[PDB]
């Protein structure tokens, strides 16, 4: 089940990509934007980014109250 | 037909030189005027000459 695509885009939040230059960061861009655009599809993606999220709002409750 | 078309990419690294036979193989990776230029002369072109 965590291996096929879920029906909703992705989870994780992940920063923008650096500017590029023709040699490696087309190689590295390339790369990061398809890895990036398969696994964030899968459901193994949804759980990763409730557990960032939730277990954060958790670590803030720990010093608010 | 003469010397013929050069491809290369952003990189400025790889470049592919193309025969004037070839050109009708590559067709519309060639830039928009290139190929309004071309299309009409298909009609009268031959393998390396133009009739």
Redesign the interface.
């Known amino acids: 089940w965590a291996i096929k695509d879920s029906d909703l885009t992705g989870w994780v939040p992940m920063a923008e990509y650096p500017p590029a230059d023709?040699?490696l960061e087309?190689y590295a861009e390339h790369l990061n934007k398809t890895m990036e655009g398969v696994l964030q599809g899968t459901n193994c993606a949804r759980e990763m980014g409730k557990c960032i999220l939730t277990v954060g709002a958790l670590m803030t409750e720990c010093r608010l109250f | 037909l003469g010397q013929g078309i050069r491809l290369s990419?952003?990189?400025?690294?790889k470049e592919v030189i193309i025969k004037a036979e070839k050109m009708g193989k590559y067709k519309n990776l060639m830039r928009e005027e290139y190929k309004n230029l071309f299309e009409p002369l298909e009609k009268y072109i031959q393998k390396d000459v133009c009739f």
């Open positions: 023709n040699e087309d | 990419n952003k990189r400025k690294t």
